[PDB]
């Protein structure tokens, strides 16, 4: 049946760098954007929600506006790639990619953030 | 928009009893079992996958084999009813019903399990 896959179920990224998290789903010939739903989430916070060709910004969590982007070029290749810029320790956790495209599936991804002591200390105080 | 709703987001159950957890979804005009996808989950363990007309269970977790079923005749009324028989302390946690029906939404449901000392002891010690 319709199956979402990830080339990587674990990412280890460096504090302050950018990460792109990949999420593949089958596309026959070309994408029908009006049939597509892409839901990126991270432990119960909505990061991105792409419904039938355009994103719903009313539900996006404030922490991810201005840092999260759905690479819509990769959408047509069947790759719902999430890009987070300026990765912080609070971005460590479990991510879920959910696609509805004539069928529905989801996959989990775990992000670990390596950080130097100064950055961990500031996060530690908050 | 396609909204999934729950009449209750919290269930309290007695150890060893049966629980039936409910998710409602909008059925516009006649139910098209072909376009319906239902996932029941609990702390990222898969309980049920209902993919276009039938139950997929080769992805169903151990902890719910022989105990979980989707109440299929409720589907016509827009009701994704998950029934767990022989409820155990480890059934406590946060559940998720995820529904794809020409729109996609999920809701969370917390379950608490009351239990007598002995049941709690065996589960605590394991
Ligand atoms: O459940 C959701 N909620 C919000 N968006 C989306 S896109 C795809 C899904 C989905 C639904 C059921 C099973 C597998 C995936 C989904």
UniProtKB/Swiss-Prot annotation, chains A, B:
Entry comment describing in which tissues the protein is expressed: Highly expressed in the heart, skeletal muscle, placenta and lung. Weakly expressed in the thymus, spleen, kidney and liver. Expressed on activated T- and B-cells, dendritic cells, keratinocytes and monocytes.
Glycosylation site residues: 18
Function: Plays a critical role in induction and maintenance of immune tolerance to self. As a ligand for the inhibitory receptor PDCD1/PD-1, modulates the activation threshold of T-cells and limits T-cell effector response. Through a yet unknown activating receptor, may costimulate T-cell subsets that predominantly produce interleukin-10 (IL10). Can also act as a transcription coactivator: in response to hypoxia, translocates into the nucleus via its interaction with phosphorylated STAT3 and promotes transcription of GSDMC, leading to pyroptosis. The PDCD1-mediated inhibitory pathway is exploited by tumors to attenuate anti-tumor immunity and escape destruction by the immune system, thereby facilitating tumor survival. The interaction with PDCD1/PD-1 inhibits cytotoxic T lymphocytes (CTLs) effector function. The blockage of the PDCD1-mediated pathway results in the reversal of the exhausted T-cell phenotype and the normalization of the anti-tumor response, providing a rationale for cancer immunotherapy.
PTM notes: Ubiquitinated; STUB1 likely mediates polyubiquitination of PD-L1/CD274 triggering its degradation. Ubiquitinated by MARCHF8; leading to degradation. Deubiquitinated by USP22; leading to stabilization.
Gene name per UniProt: CD274
Disulfides per UniProt: 23-97
Boundaries of every Ig-like V-type domain copy: 2-110
Subunit structure: Interacts with PDCD1. Interacts (via transmembrane domain) with CMTM4 and CMTM6. Interacts with (phosphorylated) STAT3; promoting nuclear translocation. Interacts with CD80.
Species for this entry: Homo sapiens (Human)
Entry similarity comment: Belongs to the immunoglobulin superfamily. BTN/MOG family.
Induction: Up-regulated on T- and B-cells, dendritic cells, keratinocytes and monocytes after LPS and IFNG activation. Up-regulated in B-cells activated by surface Ig cross-linking.
Subcellular location: Cell membrane; Early endosome membrane; Recycling endosome membrane; Nucleus
Disease implicated: Truncation of the 3'-untranslated (3'-UTR) region of CD274 transcripts leads to elevated expression of CD274 in multiple cancers including T-cell leukemia, diffuse large B-cell lymphoma and stomach adenocarcinoma. Disruption of 3'-UTR region is caused by structural variants that stabilize CD274 transcripts, leading to overexpression. Increased expression in tumors promotes immune evasion and tumor cell growth by allowing malignant cells to escape destruction by the immune system.
Name of this chain's protein: Programmed cell death 1 ligand 1
């Amino acid at each position: 049946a319709f199956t979402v896959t990830v080339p990587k179920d674990l990412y280890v990224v460096e504090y302050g760098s950018n990460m792109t998290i990949e999420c593949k789903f089958p596309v026959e010939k070309q994408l029908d954007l009006a049939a597509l739903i892409v839901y990126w989430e991270m432990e119960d916070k909505n990061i991105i929600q792409f419904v039938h060709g355009e994103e719903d910004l009313k539900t996006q969590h404030s922490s991810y506006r201005q840092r999260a982007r759905l690479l819509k070029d990769q959408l047509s290749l069947g790759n719902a790639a999430l890009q987070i810029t300026d990765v912080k320790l609070q971005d460590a956790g479990v991510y879920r990619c959910m696609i509805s495209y004539g069928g529905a599936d989801y996959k989990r991804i775990t992000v670990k953030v390596n950080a130097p002591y100064a950055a961990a200390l500031e996060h530690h105080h908050h």
